[PDB]
Design a protein around this nucleic acid. Structure first.
Ligand SMILES: [Cl-]
Ligand SMILES: [Cl-]
Ligand SMILES: [Cl-]
Ligand SMILES: [Mg+2]
Ligand SMILES: [Mg+2]
Ligand SMILES: [Mg+2]
Ligand SMILES: [Mg+2]
Ligand SMILES: [Mg+2]
Ligand SMILES: [Mg+2]
Ligand SMILES: [Mg+2]
Ligand SMILES: [Mg+2]
Ligand SMILES: [Mg+2]
Ligand SMILES: [Mg+2]
Ligand SMILES: [Mg+2]
Ligand SMILES: [Mg+2]
Ligand SMILES: [Mg+2]
Ligand SMILES: [Mg+2]
Ligand SMILES: [Mg+2]
Ligand code: NA
Ligand code: NA
Ligand code: NA
Ligand code: NA
Ligand code: NA
Ligand code: NA
Ligand code: NA
Ligand code: NA
Ligand code: NA
Ligand code: NA
Ligand code: NA
Ligand code: NA
Ligand code: NA
Ligand code: NA
Ligand code: NA
Ligand code: NA
Ligand code: NA
Ligand code: NA
Ligand code: NA
Ligand code: NA
Ligand code: NA
Lengths: 115, 145, 246, 119
RNA sequence: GCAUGGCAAGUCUAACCGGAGUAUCCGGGGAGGCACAGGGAAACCGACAUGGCCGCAGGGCUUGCCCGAGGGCCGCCGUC
RNA sequence: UAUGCCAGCUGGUGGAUUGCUCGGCUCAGGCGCUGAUGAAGGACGUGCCAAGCUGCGAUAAGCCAUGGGGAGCCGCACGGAGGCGAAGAACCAUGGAUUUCCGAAUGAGAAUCUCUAACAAUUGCUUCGCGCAAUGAGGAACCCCGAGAACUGAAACAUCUCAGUAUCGGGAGGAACAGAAAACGCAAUGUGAUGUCGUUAGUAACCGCGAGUGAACGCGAUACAGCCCAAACCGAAGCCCUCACGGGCAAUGUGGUGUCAGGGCUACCUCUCAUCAGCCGACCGUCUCGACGAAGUCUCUUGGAACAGAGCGUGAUACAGGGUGACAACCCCGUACUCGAGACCAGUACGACGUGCGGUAGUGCCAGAGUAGCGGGGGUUGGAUAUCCCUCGCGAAUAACGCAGGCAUCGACUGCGAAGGCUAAACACAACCUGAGACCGAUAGUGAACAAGUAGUGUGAACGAACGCUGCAAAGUACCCUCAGAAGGGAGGCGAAAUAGAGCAUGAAAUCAGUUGGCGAUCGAGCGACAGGGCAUACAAGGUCCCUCGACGAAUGAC
């Protein structure tokens, strides 16, 4: 009963990758997205900066928000980013859509889940 | 299909015995009735407590934590840079219908800051100086004695 | 992307950059919600007379005559819901708020999204429109705004291989139901939407199933009638440009 | 008034002088060219041709015009009663066309000719 | 409370104003509300952008061993 | 196999159902008072024939004028007879005539009539004469001022609540009311008449501190507008009636000045563009009404009828809606476009006429009393000590004074001048006009689509229904037989259809007559479910089924 056709498609793609490729994060993210919006992740930069590390893609099974400061040069992949978040992140790293992540790494390797 | 939509034919619409859904007696009284008797449970106790000072003898302090200021120093490009120097009064929203602006010391301070505000807390001060900063008290701030 | 501008003869005449908004991801759900709201908000409040069926002193005799305790007057039942001529138990109410709210953001998004659905030849085709063109929307010189005769706009459309859609909308449906008794006897398919810049195309408005709008206030309804994205549209050189900032 | 009920009502209750427009009929190609009007208010003097009923095709002179019932009697357009008598079959001007006009009225002819008024 | 959806340290406009295709609709309007700090009758004061330990999912590795968001158990801080 | 059971068929009864809508319901814009110059309402009249409704008033479904309109007409109402209209009728708009009796009802009385000139009654002016005038009553609600419940809630109940609600008395208008601070009190170096809308806020405040009740300043908007007396100083310089003459008012003060940017007075400066009075007087907009207004009524087929199918063609600043013998942009009304008129905005805005604003210095000349204020008692309010009001008693100052800033007193500070008055606009309602609709669609929706506040009930206050649909066209059934017969019936005629024949579209069920299938006068009662047999069955929309044998063959499993 999701309404967003896009969110719906992302979820189907996340599965196709988790099944075909050896990914497990993708299937993991898919299940959380299938869950009620209220349980989805709403992460600010402060937390990403605190537990992320370079050369390890940050995966947010939700949306990323721009509160706080991010200095580490990391690649963050989320369902969506507030405009401020995506601006602060591209200043020191790279903001990426989950759909790109699934394509540049269907194996879901070297990835860290943050929520 | 919603719940209501499925009620036709149930006779009782989920009310149990048809002798149930009548008047206020099924509610044990109208409104807050029995908040002291049969339904005292989960009602704050009865009684008066304390007092209030006249509304116009009250002062509302506009507050902000150092962490906020600090996290957006660079972003506040439209505010003095020196050996940064920021007049809090110009940062804090609601700083108009406010009897005065006060800086609170929550979070860290990773820059050398010169803060001008009507008031500061110990923590705010220690932290701002600790980062090689200073705290300037406004003329209004001249109300300390 | 590129937009092929057409002259009043139907011949290519240079081309402009298709603004970005036409690239906004098509979100039929949001579109649908904007059309739903627009349609709800123009619905009029109604309800029965507050006193219908209560205008009487009918009383119930109570026990004693082998009669059910129903209010009666002149030996005729009255007032109560189950009686003929009695009150409607839970009738329509003037007080009811039949309007729908919608965040300006969510609404503008749908406008943008509807706009974008316009530049997708497949969608437009699925929505049902009839035409033999590859590029869409149809862009035209501002000289279009000067046309005066409907007939002239027709030739231009026939030359743009889009008249077929008006042929489609050139059929009225006589509805099933009593709407008929209320003045809603007919209904017809929606055809082309003409978006101009200065004023709505007087010359095109009478076209079968056509709707004329202006770039500054063109909305979700005209862009996506019935909440269905992809309406065969024709913008004006200038219109196209204005639309970009909506 | 887009509402059917109101439309029908105003047509049925229109005062007498407003009914003249209900007894109007198209003009032959020639006549339309001659007076620059598409139709005219059928008068008991005009000749007319039946374009739609069971009498379609027949021509005759307009014998009577009833404003209340917005109907006209055309000569020879009749019905056989049980007793053998012949009575007129009312016709709606909408199914009729004027081929000849009775212009004995200065006023009517004047209206017909002018280009700012129609008769 | 819940499901879906938009925006996110913010969010939403109300009356009302302009436009117009004239009750829809496009634009404007942040007055004000809730959220962003709490504690205390009041005066008044005013907090962890993370210090430690377990550990699920997930990731990594030389396949038990590391990293371990969320979660749990503590510390520590504001205030009475 | 009587009485009879079940199902169906033909006919009926009944009026559901479907379809239709001349009526409702609701929203929205415009507009908005009438009356002694006798209203609103009622009564009785009024037609060739006239019972109801509508109109009208002894000039009685009407008379006259001007404009529109047009060859027809004589209301709903389609009969018979007769008549009117080119001397321009009908019909519509505006204005005018007539306009019985009761009715505020006013000469007096009275159930709509009667008795012998009449503003009855109460008032103002007054030529002190009803001479000149006012009031009265109506109106859908809205508005303002008074009087003021209870059921109910509090799970009982008294304060409290319901609620200043219902109901009552008085009264205005098209809107009312309010209104230019003895204000506010984000306390300020700040705001600046008043309604209203949004918010402030379910906040402050109240309350068997229970249940409940409940603002304001401010802010954002709407619309904006500011003035006149009393007095000081003048002192008849004045006002009303009347054509005039003449009369009346007025020293108990008409009139000038003046009104917190305080004023007056005295001496000065400058000036008028404020204000007040009067003249003129709209645009635009909006609501309604009206004029003009494009393009097929072509072919073949079906049909009673083309507005259907197929084919050919056309307009469109007009493809809203309606009508027309079936689905119509092009057959008719209309619709887009353009144009005109009335009403409202408004005797407003603008323009102009007259007046004269303002400033300095001096001056204790003037500035609203049962008041401000205190006390008793009640009511009301969120108003708590700190709401507003009534009642009883007491009771002040004089701007060098006074009142307010949410307890009292004194001082300071800030604001502001009560006890005189007026005031446009923005807001309420919905009688009236018009528009609109995811409203209802004849047991619905109004009580009322119909004779509807009708028939009918009650002494009376008051109560109060049901009834929509022939057909394209009345072509609404001639003639003949029968009959006591304008009844009914038979035969016949019209129409696509009479099983459309008059409360006549469709025509359900309960149910009735006749009739078909099955059962039936020796037999037992939840009327059936599932199995299996008899008998019965036009087509259609289901096409399967039977027996020998043979293949396969779970659990089970022999003689
Ligand atoms: Cl976070
Ligand atoms: Cl307090
Ligand atoms: Cl203020
Ligand atoms: Mg603010
Ligand atoms: Mg009813
Ligand atoms: Mg139906
Ligand atoms: Mg002419
Ligand atoms: Mg009398
Ligand atoms: Mg009680
Ligand atoms: Mg109690
Ligand atoms: Mg008021
Ligand atoms: Mg109260
Ligand atoms: Mg206040
Ligand atoms: Mg004066
Ligand atoms: Mg009270
Ligand atoms: Mg009824
Ligand atoms: Mg019938
Ligand atoms: Mg037995
Ligand atoms: Na339940
Ligand atoms: Na029940
Ligand atoms: Na209770
Ligand atoms: Na207790
Ligand atoms: Na009644
Ligand atoms: Na009974
Ligand atoms: Na409503
Ligand atoms: Na705000
Ligand atoms: Na009016
Ligand atoms: Na009569
Ligand atoms: Na009269
Ligand atoms: Na009088
Ligand atoms: Na007298
Ligand atoms: Na109780
Ligand atoms: Na009791
Ligand atoms: Na109480
Ligand atoms: Na303020
Ligand atoms: Na016709
Ligand atoms: Na008192
Ligand atoms: Na004050
Ligand atoms: Na009925």
């Amino acid at each position: 009963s999701k309404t967003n056709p896009r969110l719906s498609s992302l979820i189907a793609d996340l599965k196709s990758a988790a099944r075909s490729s050896g990914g497990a994060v993708w299937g993991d993210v898919a299940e959380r997205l299938e869950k009620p919006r209220r349980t989805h992740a709403e992460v600010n930069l402060g937390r990403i900066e605190r537990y992320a590390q370079e050369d390890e893609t940050v995966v947010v099974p939700g949306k990323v928000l721009g509160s706080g400061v991010l200095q580490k040069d990391v690649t963050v992949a989320a369902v969506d980013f507030s405009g401020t978040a995506e601006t602060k992140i591209d200043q020191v790293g790279e903001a990426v859509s989950l759909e790109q992540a699934i394509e540049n790494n269907p194996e879901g390797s070297h990835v860290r889940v943050i929520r | 299909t919603s719940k209501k939509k499925r009620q036709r034919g149930s006779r009782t619409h989920g009310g149990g015995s048809h002798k149930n859904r009548r008047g206020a007696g099924h509610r044990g009284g109208r409104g807050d009735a029995g908040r002291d008797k049969h339904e005292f449970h989960n009602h704050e106790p009865l009684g008066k407590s304390g007092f209030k000072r006249p509304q116009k003898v009250q002062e509302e302090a506009a507050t902000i934590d150092v962490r906020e200021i600090d996290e957006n120093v660079t972003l506040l490009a439209a505010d003095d840079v020196a050996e940064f120097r920021v007049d809090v009064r110009d940062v804090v929203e609601e700083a108009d219908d406010a009897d005065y602006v006060k800086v609170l010391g929550a979070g860290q301070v990773r820059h050398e800051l010169t803060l001008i505000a009507d008031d500061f807390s110990e923590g705010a001060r220690e932290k701002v100086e600790g980062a090689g900063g200073s705290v300037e008290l406004t003329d209004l701030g001249e109300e300390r004695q | 992307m590129q937009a092929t501008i057409y002259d009043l003869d139907g011949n290519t005449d240079g081309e402009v950059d298709l603004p970005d908004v036409f690239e906004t991801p098509v979100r039929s759900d949001l579109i649908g919600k904007a059309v739903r709201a627009a349609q709800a908000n123009r619905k009029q409040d109604y309800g029965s007379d507050e006193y219908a069926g209560l205008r009487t002193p009918a009383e119930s005799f109570g026990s004693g005559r082998g009669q059910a305790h129903v209010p009666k007057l002149d030996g005729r039942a009255r007032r109560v819901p189950q009686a003929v001529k009695g009150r409607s138990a839970h009738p329509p109410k003037t007080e009811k708020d039949r309007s729908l709210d919608l965040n300006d953001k969510e609404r503008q998004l749908a406008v943008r999204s509807a706009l974008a659905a316009t530049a997708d030849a497949d969608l437009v085709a699925d929505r049902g429109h009839e035409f033999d063109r590859d590029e869409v929307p149809v862009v035209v010189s501002d000289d279009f705004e000067d046309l005066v005769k409907t007939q002239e706009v027709v030739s231009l459309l026939e030359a743009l291989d889009v008249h077929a859609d008006i042929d489609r909308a050139d059929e009225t449906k006589i509805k099933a139901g009593q709407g008929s008794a209320r003045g809603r006897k007919y209904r017809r398919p929606a055809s082309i939407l003409f978006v101009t810049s200065d004023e709505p195309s007087t010359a095109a408005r009478n076209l079968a199933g056509a709707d004329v709008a202006t770039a500054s206030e063109v909305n979700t309804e005209d862009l996506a009638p019935g909440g269905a994205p992809g309406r065969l549209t024709v913008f004006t050189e200038s219109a196209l440009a204005e639309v970009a900032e909506r | 008034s887009k509402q059917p009920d109101k439309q029908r009502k105003s047509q049925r209750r229109a005062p007498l002088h407003e009914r003249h427009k209900q007894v109007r009929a198209t003009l032959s190609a020639d006549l339309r060219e001659e007076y620059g009007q598409r139709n005219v208010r059928v008068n008991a003097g005009d000749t007319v041709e039946v374009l739609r009923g069971d009498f379609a095709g027949e021509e005759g002179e307009v014998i009577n015009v009833d404003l209340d019932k917005a109907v006209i009697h055309v000569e020879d357009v009749t019905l056989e009663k049980t007793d053998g008598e012949e009575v007129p079959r009312p016709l709606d001007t909408s199914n009729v066309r004027v081929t000849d006009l009775d212009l004995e009225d200065e006023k009517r002819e004047a209206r017909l000719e002018s280009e700012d008024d129609s008769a």
